């Protein structure tokens, strides 16, 4: 009686939101950006190849200086690279080799990683002893750690396969806020540039926008047909793009609270692993299961170019803060640095 | 062309590469085993004989270092991380023979033995384990014999025309799992009957792994 009545009210509320989004769907982003000229063909060459990982690379993250990056592989090795020289700055042996994510702190003093061990481990890069040591192990998730991102040297947000995200106080080792509401494994998260919000994509094919301080879900974005594996905020923080196993990338708007554009091709039938934007946001770069990275026109949904330099899955990618280059990590155990030439 | 600190930084990177190579060579020599099986299948008892996320067991037997990975504690989506174990030497699958007449606790309408069949079929025919051999432990053999006298296999297998002897009942169950192998040429299934009092379970894994290693070498050279 009461349960049946309540679940009927949820359906009425869902229709109310769907009608509200349809009311403000006056135009399409495709129609708006029809007049602007295309970006042309985007040609990028492999400037650097980072060799030394001996297993599948699962994650990479640039440091904020646009020169150092950290990559994680399931050979149990965290490597910090000097991308300008390809020198290895550090090699951090992981206690658990089943790493799935890694993050570089914006200060450059810490890196974080974690996987099937259900732990987010914090590593101190600047010690008087001259070696990288574990500074914190964040326990509390009951599923694998899928993504982690620093807010500062003391706070980090983690998404897990136990359907929840958490905000952690690194010094006390406790999760201050728990973000619940996903019905599937949360596979990725992205921080807004002001670090007041973050979006997460789960296996319920939905993306939720969370308030960091308040700790609740502000908006829910649907439209994917399969698990979301990747997510990335637009550079101004007013939009984000997702990548799913349905071979599509979608651009959702925060303020319009709906999808704006879909990035898919008929030839593309493989899942998407990673998404990122160029510095101006005009380019959407996506890594795929078909060993390739497709550069999309974000505004016009045109495939601008292809980065074809890996013999296995493109598992991760990232664009530097200065926008100079893009790094691609792959299951073939290599990282590549790409940019164009005049 | 390089400064004094640039040369020192390059030299430090060279030392890291040497250490990465040594660790990789050591890892390649170890034997990786993915330990699978449903709950209450005797899988925990197997670990003790072999002496909140993933549990790793390390043991040495006849100069061979084994790394056994237990993933039963993980309750998340299997398809999001099962590819992480692509490349293990072999998969150890545990099936409790005494659960043929039991009913799954959660479902209350699914046979416990039939629950392992769909788990075995998914793992055996998984795309990430096309060329991976499977070691099948049929546990609770002493308890299975006791239950056979009281409860026949007709409850578990309605279309069973065999007798109720201990040898015939166990052999039929073994053939049921091996028939689920949709790729009988790329991979092989090694079946062993285990018990809580058995002490030859480690030897069987060593023999099965040694056979897998030999066939891997023959296939790598292109002989197969």
């Amino acid at each position, epitope marked *: 009686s009461e349960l049946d009545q309540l679940r009927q009210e949820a359906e009425q509320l869902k229709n109310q939101i769907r009608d509200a989004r349809k009311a403000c769907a006056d135009a399409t982003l495709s129609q708006i950006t029809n007049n602007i000229d295309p970006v042309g063909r985007i040609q990028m060459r492999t400037r650097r190849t980072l060799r030394g990982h001996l297993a599948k690379i699962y994650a990479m993250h640039w440091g904020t200086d646009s020169r*150092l990056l950290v990559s994680a592989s399931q050979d149990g090795k965290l490597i910090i690279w000097d991308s300008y020289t390809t020198n290895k*700055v550090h090699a951090i042996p992981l206690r658990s080799s089943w790493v799935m994510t890694c993050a570089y702190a914006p200060s450059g003093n810490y890196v974080a990683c974690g996987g099937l061990d259900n732990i987010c481990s914090i590593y101190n890069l600047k010690t*008087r*002893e*001259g070696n990288v040591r574990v500074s914190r192990e964040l326990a509390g998730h009951t599923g694998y750690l899928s993504c982690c991102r620093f807010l500062d040297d003391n706070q980090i947000v983690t998404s897990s396969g136990d359907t929840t995200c958490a905000l952690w106080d690194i010094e006390t080792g406790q999760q201050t806020t728990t973000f619940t509401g996903h019905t599937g494994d949360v596979m990725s998260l992205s921080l807004a540039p002001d670090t007041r919000l973050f979006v997460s994509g789960a296996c319920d094919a939905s993306a939720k926008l969370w308030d960091v301080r308040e700790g609740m879900c502000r908006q829910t974005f649907t439209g994917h047909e399969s698990d979301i594996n990747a997510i990335c905020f637009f550079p101004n923080g007013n939009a984000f793009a997702t990548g799913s196993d349905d071979a599509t990338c979608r651009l959702f708007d925060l303020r319009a609270d709906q999808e704006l554009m879909t990035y898919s091709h008929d030839n593309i039938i493989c899942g998407i692993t990673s998404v990122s934007f160029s510095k101006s946001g005009r380019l959407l770069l996506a890594g795929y299961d078909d060993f390739n990275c497709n550069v999309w026109d974000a505004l016009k949904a045109d495939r601008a170019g292809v980065l074809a330099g890996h013999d296995n899955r493109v598992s991760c990618l990232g664009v530097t803060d200065d926008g100079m280059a893009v790094a691609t990590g792959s299951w073939d155990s290599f990282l590549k640095i790409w940019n164009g030439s005049s | 062309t390089l*400064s004094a*600190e*640039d040369k020192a930084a390059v030299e*430090r990177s060279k*030392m890291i590469d040497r250490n990465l190579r040594e660790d990789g060579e050591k890892a390649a020599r170890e034997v990786k085993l993915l330990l699978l099986g449903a709950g209450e299948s005797g899988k925990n008892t197997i670990v003790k004989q072999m002496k909140t996320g993933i549990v790793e067991t390390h043991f040495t037997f006849k100069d061979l270092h084994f790394k056994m990975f237990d993933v039963g504690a993980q309750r998340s989506e299997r398809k999001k991380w099962i590819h992480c174990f692509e490349g293990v030497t072999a998969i150890i699958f545990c099936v409790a023979l005494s659960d043929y007449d039991l009913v799954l606790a959660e479902d209350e309408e699914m046979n416990r033995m039939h629950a392992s069949m769909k788990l075995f079929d998914s793992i055996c025919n998984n795309k990430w384990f096309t060329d991976t051999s499977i070691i099948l432990f049929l546990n609770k053999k002493d308890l299975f014999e006791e239950k056979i006298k009281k409860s026949p296999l007709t409850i578990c297998y309605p279309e069973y025309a065999g007798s109720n002897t201990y040898e015939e009942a166990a052999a039929y169950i073994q053939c049921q799992f091996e028939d689920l192998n949709k790729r009988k040429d790329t991979k092989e299934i090694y079946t062993h009957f285990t018990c809580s009092t058995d002490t030859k379970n480690v030897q069987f894994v060593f023999d099965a792994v040694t056979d897998v290693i030999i066939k891997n070498n023959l296939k790598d050279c292109g002989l197969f």
Partner: single-chain antibody
Amino acid sequence: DVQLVESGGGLVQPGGSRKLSCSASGFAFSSFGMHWVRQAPEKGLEWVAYISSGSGTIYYADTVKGRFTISRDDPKNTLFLQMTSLRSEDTAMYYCVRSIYYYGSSPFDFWGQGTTLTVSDIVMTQATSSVPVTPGESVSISCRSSKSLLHSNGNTYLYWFLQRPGQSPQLLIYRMSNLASGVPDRFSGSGSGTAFTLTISRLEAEDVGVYYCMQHLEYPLTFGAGTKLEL
């Protein structure tokens, strides 16, 4: 805590041999390159030798090459300096210095207390030998180099050290602008090409001492004469 203890120094006869030891505790010794730096009595710092992490690269100063041998024992965390044919020119306090080299590292960050031995090229110029100072007032120290210390990679390999009376040198500024860990922000390093300035805003009693500018552009590492601050 990070420690570097030297031993084996003492009065030796001319033409003799002596073995200096540097025991390291509290840090990953095998990860750091090691230098021997000596300081003649009432004189400035002079670099002696360098052995890299992993013992693959070894450098010597010309005045000691062929007579000194530098070695390390990584399992024992000991740095060695085997000296032969010791001359009266070798009478100095010998310091054990750790230095790690990667992008953004701070070489020469920790020095040992030193052991005293008594026996019976880019030019770095610090023309101002002494500077009278008063607490709370801003002080500038100048350094010059015969060659440009700015490399084509953008680094300017100039270092600033402070040796307080009775103490071992401590790193203040590395690569001409970066502030060493544990150093107050009042110290600031400014330079261009061959001319460099160390500015000390709001001078305090602790800042009193001798200041050395060192180049790390190439071997042999050379020190300036040193500028002394006095009240």
